[PDB]
Design an enzyme around this catalytic site. Structure first.
Site, PDB file in Angstrom:
ATOM      1  NE  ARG A 103      -3.583   2.322   2.681  1.00 46.64           N
ATOM      2  CZ  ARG A 103      -3.500   3.067   3.772  1.00 46.64           C
ATOM      3  NH1 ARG A 103      -2.826   2.665   4.834  1.00 46.64           N
ATOM      4  NH2 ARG A 103      -4.095   4.258   3.797  1.00 46.64           N
ATOM      5  CG  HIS A 105      -1.919   5.011  -1.197  1.00 42.69           C
ATOM      6  ND1 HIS A 105      -2.749   5.506  -0.220  1.00 42.69           N
ATOM      7  CD2 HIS A 105      -2.653   4.132  -1.914  1.00 42.69           C
ATOM      8  CE1 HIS A 105      -3.920   4.902  -0.296  1.00 42.69           C
ATOM      9  NE2 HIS A 105      -3.888   4.053  -1.310  1.00 42.69           N
ATOM     10  CG  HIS A 110      -7.684  -4.734  -2.574  1.00 47.84           C
ATOM     11  ND1 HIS A 110      -8.734  -4.005  -3.092  1.00 47.84           N
ATOM     12  CD2 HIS A 110      -6.786  -3.827  -2.130  1.00 47.84           C
ATOM     13  CE1 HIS A 110      -8.486  -2.717  -2.936  1.00 47.84           C
ATOM     14  NE2 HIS A 110      -7.301  -2.581  -2.367  1.00 47.84           N
ATOM     15  CD1 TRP A 128     -11.205  -6.925  -0.859  1.00 50.66           C
ATOM     16  CD2 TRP A 128      -9.433  -6.428   0.406  1.00 50.66           C
ATOM     17  NE1 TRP A 128     -11.075  -5.556  -0.829  1.00 50.66           N
ATOM     18  CE2 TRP A 128      -9.999  -5.227  -0.048  1.00 50.66           C
ATOM     19  CE3 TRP A 128      -8.283  -6.379   1.212  1.00 50.66           C
ATOM     20  CZ2 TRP A 128      -9.466  -3.983   0.278  1.00 50.66           C
ATOM     21  CZ3 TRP A 128      -7.742  -5.142   1.518  1.00 50.66           C
ATOM     22  CH2 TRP A 128      -8.340  -3.961   1.051  1.00 50.66           C
ATOM     23  CG  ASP A 161     -12.645  -4.687  -3.950  1.00 50.20           C
ATOM     24  OD1 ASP A 161     -11.518  -4.514  -4.451  1.00 50.20           O
ATOM     25  OD2 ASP A 161     -12.878  -4.573  -2.726  1.00 50.20           O
TER      26      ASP A 161
HETATM   27  C1  HEM Z   1      -8.626  -0.113  -7.438  1.00 53.29           C
HETATM   28  C2  HEM Z   1      -8.812   0.908  -6.588  1.00 53.29           C
HETATM   29  C3  HEM Z   1      -8.424   0.797  -5.118  1.00 53.29           C
HETATM   30  C4  HEM Z   1      -9.161   1.216  -4.084  1.00 53.29           C
HETATM   31  C5  HEM Z   1     -10.548   1.877  -4.096  1.00 53.29           C
HETATM   32  C6  HEM Z   1      -8.452   0.892  -2.863  1.00 53.29           C
HETATM   33  C7  HEM Z   1      -8.893   1.118  -1.582  1.00 53.29           C
HETATM   34  C8  HEM Z   1      -8.348   0.619  -0.423  1.00 53.29           C
HETATM   35  C9  HEM Z   1      -8.803   0.824   0.926  1.00 53.29           C
HETATM   36  C10 HEM Z   1     -10.019   1.669   1.306  1.00 53.29           C
HETATM   37  C11 HEM Z   1      -7.964   0.165   1.735  1.00 53.29           C
HETATM   38  C12 HEM Z   1      -8.016   0.068   3.258  1.00 53.29           C
HETATM   39  C13 HEM Z   1      -6.941   0.913   3.955  1.00 53.29           C
HETATM   40  C14 HEM Z   1      -7.021   0.689   5.434  1.00 53.29           C
HETATM   41  O1  HEM Z   1      -8.090   0.933   6.021  1.00 53.29           O
HETATM   42  O2  HEM Z   1      -6.039   0.221   6.032  1.00 53.29           O
HETATM   43  C15 HEM Z   1      -6.969  -0.478   0.942  1.00 53.29           C
HETATM   44  C16 HEM Z   1      -5.960  -1.282   1.409  1.00 53.29           C
HETATM   45  C17 HEM Z   1      -5.003  -1.944   0.678  1.00 53.29           C
HETATM   46  N1  HEM Z   1      -4.762  -1.712  -0.661  1.00 53.29           N
HETATM   47 FE1  HEM Z   1      -6.122  -0.889  -1.982  1.00 53.29          FE
HETATM   48  N2  HEM Z   1      -7.276   0.259  -3.211  1.00 53.29           N
HETATM   49  C18 HEM Z   1      -7.220   0.219  -4.592  1.00 53.29           C
HETATM   50  C19 HEM Z   1      -6.163  -0.269  -5.303  1.00 53.29           C
HETATM   51  C20 HEM Z   1      -5.042  -0.904  -4.805  1.00 53.29           C
HETATM   52  C21 HEM Z   1      -3.862  -1.228  -5.560  1.00 53.29           C
HETATM   53  C22 HEM Z   1      -3.679  -0.873  -7.036  1.00 53.29           C
HETATM   54  C23 HEM Z   1      -3.017  -1.853  -4.739  1.00 53.29           C
HETATM   55  C24 HEM Z   1      -1.638  -2.451  -5.011  1.00 53.29           C
HETATM   56  C25 HEM Z   1      -1.342  -3.074  -6.143  1.00 53.29           C
HETATM   57  C26 HEM Z   1      -3.632  -1.927  -3.439  1.00 53.29           C
HETATM   58  C27 HEM Z   1      -3.127  -2.539  -2.296  1.00 53.29           C
HETATM   59  C28 HEM Z   1      -3.695  -2.523  -1.039  1.00 53.29           C
HETATM   60  C29 HEM Z   1      -3.287  -3.285   0.119  1.00 53.29           C
HETATM   61  C30 HEM Z   1      -2.173  -4.341   0.085  1.00 53.29           C
HETATM   62  C31 HEM Z   1      -4.084  -2.955   1.144  1.00 53.29           C
HETATM   63  C32 HEM Z   1      -4.072  -3.519   2.588  1.00 53.29           C
HETATM   64  C33 HEM Z   1      -3.156  -2.726   3.503  1.00 53.29           C
HETATM   65  C34 HEM Z   1      -3.028  -3.289   4.888  1.00 53.29           C
HETATM   66  O3  HEM Z   1      -3.358  -4.468   5.091  1.00 53.29           O
HETATM   67  O4  HEM Z   1      -2.565  -2.556   5.790  1.00 53.29           O
HETATM   68  N3  HEM Z   1      -4.858  -1.310  -3.493  1.00 53.29           N
HETATM   69  N4  HEM Z   1      -7.222  -0.175  -0.387  1.00 53.29           N
END
Ligand code: HEM
Ligand code: NA
Length: 250
Positions: free
Chosen positions: A38, A42, A163, A179, A208
């Site tokens: 993440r 970002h 995810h 997820w 998603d």
């Molecule tokens: C497609 C649009 C996307 C949306 C709307 C989105 C949204 C989110 C949200 C709301 C979270 C939760 C953050 C939290 O509360 O800790 C999250 C976590 C995360 N995102 Fe996404 N994301 C997107 C794309 C991606 C992409 C492109 C990647 C990497 C290739 C990614 C990797 C992750 C990971 C690994 C987490 C988990 C982090 C943790 O466990 O601390 N996301 N995302």
């Protein structure tokens, strides 16, 4: 041939390798690969090709970018990695955080993403608001990944597979839950869970779910749910592109 990578010194390349080894150990030992993916995403996903602002240029170190709502909790990741960074002053933060993302995918069992050094640490963060809104749908995903970042529909679906790692936290995004049942394992389970619908103990965001109803995204969901090798190949290509937005463009 869309890239022309810069020449860096042997010492720079040696620092990349030694930092990679330290990051592999720390990320595995601290079980923080999802957070570090993440962090890298970002960092990179703020690029807008129309102004060539944002992107993977080290600005996540800047407190003003850490304060963006979408970046809640990434201050933890920056601080966790700083002891390693202190050992590698030659490296840019820009390269270092992208390397952390590549390592996070590796240590969880994902594909080996190529890494090319040389990104500069730029002084100005992007404006807040470039990253995707989890409550929106396919038109919005195409604006963010396509119009801003320049990535394809295949890239959108493959990258959404990030995810497969980790979870949402109520104090960070406000969503809560993982997820997948195995959130430290990089596999195609994200797509399998999407196809099987909502179920107790797991989360799906509106963004998603938009992949399931869109006629171009859905065949890709189906492919990756059935074929982990195809997912890994397309994910590798998309992550490479993401990690290099605005960098080394020919
Ligand atoms: C497609 C649009 C996307 C949306 C709307 C989105 C949204 C989110 C949200 C709301 C979270 C939760 C953050 C939290 O509360 O800790 C999250 C976590 C995360 N995102 Fe996404 N994301 C997107 C794309 C991606 C992409 C492109 C990647 C990497 C290739 C990614 C990797 C992750 C990971 C690994 C987490 C988990 C982090 C943790 O466990 O601390 N996301 N995302
Ligand atoms: Na998983």
């Amino acid at each position: 041939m869309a890239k022309s990578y810069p020449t860096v010194s042997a010492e720079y390349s040696e620092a990349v390798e030694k930092a990679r080894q330290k990051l592999r150990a720390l990320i595995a030992e601290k079980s923080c690969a999802p957070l570090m993916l993440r962090l890298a995403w970002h960092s990179a996903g703020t690029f807008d090709v129309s102004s060539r602002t944002g992107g993977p240029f080290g600005t996540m170190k800047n407190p003003a970018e850490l304060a963006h709502g979408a970046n809640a909790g990434l201050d933890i990741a920056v601080r966790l990695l700083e002891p390693i960074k202190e050992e590698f002053p030659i490296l840019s933060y820009a390269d270092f955080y992208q390397l952390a993302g590549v390592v996070a995918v590796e240590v969880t069992g994902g594909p080996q993403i190529p890494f090319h050094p040389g990104r500069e640490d730029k002084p100005q963060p992007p404006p807040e608001g470039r990253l995707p809104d989890a409550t929106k749908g396919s038109d919005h995903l195409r604006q963010v990944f396509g119009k801003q970042m320049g990535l394809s529909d295949q890239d959108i679906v493959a990258l959404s597979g990030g995810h497969t790692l980790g979870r949402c936290h109520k104090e960070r995004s406000g969503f809560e839950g993982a997820w997948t049942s195995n959130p430290l394992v990089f596999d195609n389970s994200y797509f399998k869970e999407l196809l099987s619908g909502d179920k107790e103990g797991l989360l799906q965001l509106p963004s998603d779910k938009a992949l399931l109803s869109d006629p171009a995204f859905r065949p890709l969901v189906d492919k990756y749910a059935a074929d982990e090798k195809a997912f890994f190949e397309d994910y590798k290509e998309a992550h490479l592109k993401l990690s290099e937005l605005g960098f080394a463009d020919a």
